[PDB]
Amino acid sequence: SEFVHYARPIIILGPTKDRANDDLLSEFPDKFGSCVPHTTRPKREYEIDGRDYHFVSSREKMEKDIQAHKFIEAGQYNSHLYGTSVQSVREVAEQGKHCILDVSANAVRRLQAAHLHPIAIFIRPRSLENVLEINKRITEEQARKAFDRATKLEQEFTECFSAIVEGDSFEEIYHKVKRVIEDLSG
């Protein structure tokens, strides 16, 4: 443990977080990776089990694993369960790549409780108009909604974010994001 250090999984929250998640995996494929989630949906014939998803045969068993606290974030969509498991985050991180995560803010303590202490970054907009600045592809109704949801997220989870990132542009946001990971890399 003194010589080799596991790569800390990464949870970026807030406006443009998916654009940051896309960009980081693109810019450094050997440093950042994605983890395979489980679903109870049946696979299409071009989806590859164990690589695109882990396809769960017994849907009854997935909720047994969910109640055994085997997932950090679970969910349903179109009648099918979805979820990132703890073992799927450990597999990326043990390759020493930072695992890029689409989890809610609630998954931070469960990763911590599982000792996979993530870098939790909150992108914080400074106004409605500021959301319009760092995301020039949303309508005001989407911006106002983006701004309120951000406000509630900081109120409830401000204490679990390793860094809060601000800027007048995604370029500025994305720079500071990359540097937080540098200063918390290890």
Partner: peptide, 12 residues
Amino acid sequence: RIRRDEYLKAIQ
């Protein structure tokens, strides 16, 4: 991530 929009969609 782009092959798992249904997952991403489920989490919200």
